Design a protein around this ligand. Structure first.
Ligand SMILES: CC(C)=CCC/C(C)=C/CSP(=O)(O)OP(=O)(O)O
Ligand SMILES: [Mg+2]
Ligand SMILES: [Mn+2]
Length: 429
């Protein structure tokens, strides 16, 4: 469309998330107003316990939206039929918007597989959210189902894992930890004992769709051990969350919260698959201690941004898994607004630590092939950082985001109207 057509639509109907064209103009505006002016502080306007939350998320990476978002959104109904879900739940998760904005320069299939991985985390997280309820309402059968589901999900990723190097087989085997007694090494493959294939989990078609794509697109030609490794780390992290939530006694420090969030942010899974889509790729980076820390910083940055945006909803859930609430429990002088400011500052320092590790990792490269591979893999994680910022910024329609921000809807509609009008006036210059 032309800027004149969109300006007329915005002046009449405002900004929506149901018209997928609006998101292209929102991301384009955010790049022009902020990134293109050297301003890397993107506004977040929400509320928590009636307090005004008006902060800026620092991220100096180029904003972009996937060209496949139109087709991804146009096929959202057939994509949702894979899931056991209501459309209200599927619309709030909005994996089409998440993947398109965090994986902006990939093929249609390589973008959709990222949407599948993020949707897997959201549906498993919502199943784990039953433990948020007070103990008077927790059903043991649902916990039994959850514990059995993640073990069956884990085995389905094991069924597509047949590494060419026996050392990679031992890497996953030793990483199973408390899940190892359930599995056995049978002819170069890790197999769950058939005694434990008890049920068909509710989201098994989703997990089978993921494993089918990974085994058909990357397994014949690439080493998919890290994709399996990050899935094991995530599934183990979910088990740790079940243990903590099931105990109903949250005593995690901010450092322990970071260590836990390093496992369950799920973005390392999407990065592992996205790394296999580029020729510039170094599997040895996954065991580099500096690269592992860079991935941990990325997960914590996304966590802290999420903690600010989801604070009010999780406050009503009485969910203690939030750095805003952990800091308030430690410091009684902090309200929700002052605590969010501290979290935003922590996210800035983690971003500087991310950029410092980046410079050290690229300098430690042995040859040009390794340098270009490391730079490509770090760029993939930078795409997710700016992508998640804009993801929360562009929550402008209620029901199509986990945390609708009506103040951002008003702010973006007012600001994009002035920007589009300036485009129409100076046209065609
Ligand atoms: C969306 C992307 C790019 C990565 C994952 C970020 C993310 C929202 C992780 C889960 S945070 P968690 O508190 O577990 O979940 P919510 O209640 O905020 O939905
Ligand atoms: Mg949380
Ligand atoms: Mn959250």
């Amino acid at each position: 469309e032309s800027p004149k057509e969109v300006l007329s639509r915005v002046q009449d109907a405002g900004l929506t998330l149901t018209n997928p064209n609006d998101l292209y103009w929102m991301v384009d505006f955010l790049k022009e107003k902020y990134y293109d002016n050297g301003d890397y502080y993107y506004p977040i306007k929400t509320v928590c316990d009636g307090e005004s939350i008006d902060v800026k998320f620092y991220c100096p990476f180029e904003p972009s939206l996937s060209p496949h978002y139109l087709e991804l959104y146009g096929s959202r109904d057939e994509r949702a039929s894979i899931y056991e879900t209501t459309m209200k739940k599927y619309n709030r998760i909005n994996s089409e918007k998440t993947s398109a904005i965090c994986t902006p320069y990939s093929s249609y299939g390589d973008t959709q597989i990222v949407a599948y991985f993020y949707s897997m985390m959201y549906y498993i997280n919502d199943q784990t959210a039953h433990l948020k309820l007070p103990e008077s309402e927790i059903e043991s059968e649902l916990i039994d189902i959850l514990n059995d589901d993640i073990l069956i999900y884990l085995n389905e990723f094991m069924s597509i894992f047949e590494p060419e190097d026996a050392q990679d087989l031992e890497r996953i085997w030793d990483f199973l930890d408390f899940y190892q007694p359930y599995f056995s090494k049978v002819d170069g493959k890790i197999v769950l004992d058939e005694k434990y294939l008890v049920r068909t989990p509710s989201q098994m078609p989703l997990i089978k769709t993921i494993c089918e794509y990974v085994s058909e697109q990357f397994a014949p030609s690439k080493n998919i051990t890290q994709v399996i490794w990050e899935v094991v780390r995530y599934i183990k992290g979910v088990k740790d969350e079940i243990h903590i939530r099931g105990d109903k006694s949250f005593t995690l420090s901010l450092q322990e919260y970071d260590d836990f969030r390093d496992k369950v942010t799920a973005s390392p899974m999407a990065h592992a698959v996205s790394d296999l889509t580029h020729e510039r790729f170094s599997y040895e980076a996954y065991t580099n201690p500096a690269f592992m820390e860079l991935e941990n910083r990325c997960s914590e940055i996304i966590t802290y941004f999420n903690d600010v945006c989801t604070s009010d909803r999780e406050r009503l859930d009485e969910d203690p898994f939030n750095s805003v609430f952990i800091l308030m429990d430690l410091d009684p002088s902090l309200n929700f607004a002052k605590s969010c400011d501290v979290v935003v500052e922590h996210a800035y320092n983690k971003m500087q630590a991310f950029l410092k590790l980046k410079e050290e990792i690229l300098e430690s490269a042995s040859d040009e092939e390794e340098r270009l591979a490391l730079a490509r893999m770090i760029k993939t994680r930078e795409d997710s950082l700016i992508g998640y910022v804009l993801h929360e910024v562009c929550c402008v329609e209620d029901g199509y985001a986990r945390d609708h921000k009506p103040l951002m809807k008003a702010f973006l509609e007012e600001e994009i109207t002035k920007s589009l009008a300036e485009k129409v006036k100076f046209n065609p210059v």
